Amino acid sequence: LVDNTNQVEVLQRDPNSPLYSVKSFEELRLKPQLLQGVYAMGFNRPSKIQENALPLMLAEPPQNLIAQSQSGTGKTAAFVLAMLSQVEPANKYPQCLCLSPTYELALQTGKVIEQMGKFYPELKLAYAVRGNKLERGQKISEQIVIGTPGTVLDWCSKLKFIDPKKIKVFVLDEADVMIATQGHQDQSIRIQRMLPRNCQMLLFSATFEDSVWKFAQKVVPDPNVIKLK
Amino acid sequence: IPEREMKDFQFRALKKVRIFDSPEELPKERSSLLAVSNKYGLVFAGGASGLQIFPTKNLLIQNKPGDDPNKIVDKVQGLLVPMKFPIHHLALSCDNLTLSACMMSSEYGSIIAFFDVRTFSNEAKQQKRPFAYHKLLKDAGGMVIDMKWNPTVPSMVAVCLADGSIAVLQVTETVKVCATLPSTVAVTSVCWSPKGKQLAVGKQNGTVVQYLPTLQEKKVIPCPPFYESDHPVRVLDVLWIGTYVFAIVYAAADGTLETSPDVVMALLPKKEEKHPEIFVNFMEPCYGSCTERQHHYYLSYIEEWDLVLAASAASTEVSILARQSDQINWESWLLEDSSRAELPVTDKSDDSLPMGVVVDYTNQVEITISDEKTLPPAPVLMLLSTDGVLCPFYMINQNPGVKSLIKTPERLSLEGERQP
Numbered sequence A: 001l002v003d004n005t006n007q008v009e010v011l012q013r014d015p016n017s018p019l020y021s022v023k024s025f026e027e028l029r030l031k032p033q034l035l036q037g038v039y040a041m042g043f044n045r046p047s048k049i050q051e052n053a054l055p056l057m058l059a060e061p062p063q064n065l066i067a068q069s070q071s072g073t074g075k076t077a078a079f080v081l082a083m084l085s086q087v088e089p090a091n092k093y094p095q096c097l098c099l100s101p102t103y104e105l106a107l108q109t110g111k112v113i114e115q116m117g118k119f120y121p122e123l124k125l126a127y128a129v130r131g132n133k134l135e136r137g138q139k140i141s142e143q144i145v146i147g148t149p150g151t152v153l154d155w156c157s158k159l160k161f162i163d164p165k166k167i168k169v170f171v172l173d174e175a176d177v178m179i180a181t182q183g184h185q186d187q188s189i190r191i192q193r194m195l196p197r198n199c200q201m202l203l204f205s206a207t208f209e210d211s212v213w214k215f216a217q218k219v220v221p222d223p224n225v226i227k228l229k
Numbered sequence B: 001i002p003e004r005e006m007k008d009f010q011f012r013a014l015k016k017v018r019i020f021d022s023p024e025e026l027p028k029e030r031s032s033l034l035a036v037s038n039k040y041g042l043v044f045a046g047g048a049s050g051l052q053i054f055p056t057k058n059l060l061i062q063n064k065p066g067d068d069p070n071k072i073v074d075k076v077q078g079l080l081v082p083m084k085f086p087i088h089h090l091a092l093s094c095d096n097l098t099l100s101a102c103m104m105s106s107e108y109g110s111i112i113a114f115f116d117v118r119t120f121s122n123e124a125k126q127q128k129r130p131f132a133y134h135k136l137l138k139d140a141g142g143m144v145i146d147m148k149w150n151p152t153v154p155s156m157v158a159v160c161l162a163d164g165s166i167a168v169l170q171v172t173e174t175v176k177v178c179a180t181l182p183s184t185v186a187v188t189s190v191c192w193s194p195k196g197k198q199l200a201v202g203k204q205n206g207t208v209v210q211y212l213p214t215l216q217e218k219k220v221i222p223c224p225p226f227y228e229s230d231h232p233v234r235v236l237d238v239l240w241i242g243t244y245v246f247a248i249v250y251a252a253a254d255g256t257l258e259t260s261p262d263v264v265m266a267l268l269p270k271k272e273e274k275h276p277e278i279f280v281n282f283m284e285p286c287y288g289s290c291t292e293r294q295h296h297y298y299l300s301y302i303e304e305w306d307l308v309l310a311a312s313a314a315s316t317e318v319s320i321l322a323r324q325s326d327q328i329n330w331e332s333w334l335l336e337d338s339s340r341a342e343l344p345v346t347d348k349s350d351d352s353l354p355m356g357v358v359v360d361y362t363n364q365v366e367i368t369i370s371d372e373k374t375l376p377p378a379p380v381l382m383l384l385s386t387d388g389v390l391c392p393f394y395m396i397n398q399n400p401g402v403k404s405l406i407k408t409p410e411r412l413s414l415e416g417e418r419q420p
């Protein structure tokens, strides 16, 4: 984790209902196997960004979020949690959905999930990325699906691999890198419109140009907002 | 039925241009609204708010390292040619000299204005009028559902109507009816043979018939066996790729646009073959997200790449069927996430859908892939969207052996213009 002398700014979706700043994971009341997962990874104290992110994300019920912080802050960790803490392994079908901007980050965020979910039994990942093997007629029984948006949108729409009206969580990672990639922005927006209202929408980005901002607002309704200097 | 991941073909987009203003309502009815000059590098955008002529090189803007590829270029300099009535179709004779616009007025019924193209390039003519009309003599019935110009006979065009009827026209310095079949034939769609020697018309019973230009019936292609009774399809659109090679879109006869259309390749036998008709089926390739428009399939062959582009009214994606190295068969291609040709989401968050489709070959500008690497100029697929937005994508192809399809344009000389 990179050091951060500057402080986080938290625009809460509900101004008159403050809740922030967990300075420990034990405070969070995480599934025992998840909190073990966390320990396993050498995580000690939550990171600056997680302190504020996780409460919102892990609220009862959970809240939506748009988050802006630089690399090595703990974005991924933070959402890996988001998802795993909603995922019921015993239910063999996708419930959590993660759009990545490159193939080579869908795999990297995979490893982080798989490592963290280590102590969930029968937890399996699906990778909706260029050159997966899945023939038609098939349906996915993996509870999480990481991938890049087209291939994912293909999975919900055309190929009927995934029924998105069963997703509980939806992350968008690197929302800046995403918009600057052909197709992606529109592709993601079309995935999103078929998710169910209750689904949690989490969106993350290094930078935050108007474009990115404007984009966030089509995708993440009733959002809490976080920016770190 | 087969499919194939294609890594060596990529639609790489240029910046999106706003032409018309986002219409209040959804352009439901069937329509083709782009023509192109590949001879003299021009493009013809119609609509219910004028006709717009652009030098093609003005519509194509490469994205620099930094741009949002979804940000629009609002307006770009062209010609506006005002129009009393709203254009439901655009089209162009093979020599490149006759734009054929198709309107619907409330006091004439449907009609067809033929402009001479020199006129648009003729400065001393501020009012750019057409030289000939053609009063089809019908109201809604007369809606020009499909209209096509002979590929090698510039004077000859084949117009085909909402009501099932069809007529073949000659257009020189004036208009002659060569032939007209009445509604009771139930023509649904139209296409010339490659050499322009015959005309193929798809109908409502489900068959595609072949006609001499004088509408004499020569060959009947039966309705594919697998569409059994109770679920009666109808040709929707028909592409004569080769003497015995056809792309043929079908669809329900009960208009239940809820069902998606099926593309079919049809390899026909020959006079020394008593072989049945081989109909290979590549079902709903362009996935129908919509069911509010009446279906189109824009279709167009690229002979020197031996592949067929195909877009639908009711889908946001361009699909590609390619002929195999097998030389008979076909395959659907599957392209990378960021290498597709799809219409953007309206800023009101809805799907923009196709109004017209064209390929420009005149382009000379070489693709600036990165800082350091530049690739030769590619043909440019373009799309008119129901949002009034045009969507240029280069068609990079790298399959070995395929050759450069680029053709330099000309300067239309005014010589021989026809006056009204």
Ligand SMILES: Nc1ncnc2c1ncn2[C@@H]1O[C@H](COP(=O)(O)OP(=O)(O)O)[C@@H](O)[C@H]1O
Residues within 6 Å of the ligand: A001, A002, A042, A043, A044, A045, A046, A047, A050, A069, A070, A071, A072, A073, A074, A075, A076, A077, A078
């Ligand atoms: N709470 C934490 N304590 C210690 N290290 C952490 C913590 N959270 C994340 N990290 C580590 O810091 C790095 C950056 O975090 P990551 O989860 O990738 O977020 P980001 O997307 O901001 O880089 C990762 O390699 C991760 O292992």
